[PDB]
Design a protein around this ligand. Structure first.
Ligand code: EHK
Length: 121
């Protein structure tokens, strides 16, 4: 376990670009990390965005978030993929939240950003 609740990370999931996240406890499993069905470690993350979403992400697809300018370094891990405008606008919102979160303590971030989960009736 390298990440704890409230840690800021970048996550690379499916078709999406590296995305700013906050590690959090899964509302059902009450853990922020687990070993998956293939025996690999995963972390539970909240994606910063105007659209709250969460996911379990494989540890190899998670990186410590040091700042928005680290994005170029992640791509370096000349040819470049373009990015759709709608997705870029959502990513810019997520980054603005991540940058604000970076200036907070882990306790302040947990209070400010942890999602509220409502059971579907
Ligand atoms: C980056 C990203 C990766 C991902 O796998 N998902 C899924 C989460 C679960 N629901 C279906 C999308 N959403 C996002 C995302 C994108 C923009 N705003 C919020 C979240």
């Amino acid at each position: 376990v390298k990440f704890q609740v409230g840690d800021l990370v970048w996550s690379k999931v499916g078709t999406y670009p590296w995305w700013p996240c906050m590690v959090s406890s899964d509302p059902q499993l009450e853990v922020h990390t687990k070993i998956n069905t293939r025996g690999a470690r995963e972390y539970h993350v909240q994606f910063f965005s105007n659209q709250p979403e969460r996911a379990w992400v494989h540890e190899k697809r998670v990186r410590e978030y040091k700042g928005h300018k680290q994005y170029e370094e992640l791509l370096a891990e000349k040819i470049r993929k373009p990015r759709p405008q709608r997705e870029r606008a959502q990513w810019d919102i997520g980054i603005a939240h991540a940058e604000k979160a970076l200036k907070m303590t882990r306790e302040e971030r947990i209070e400010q950003y942890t999602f509220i989960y409502i059971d579907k009736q």
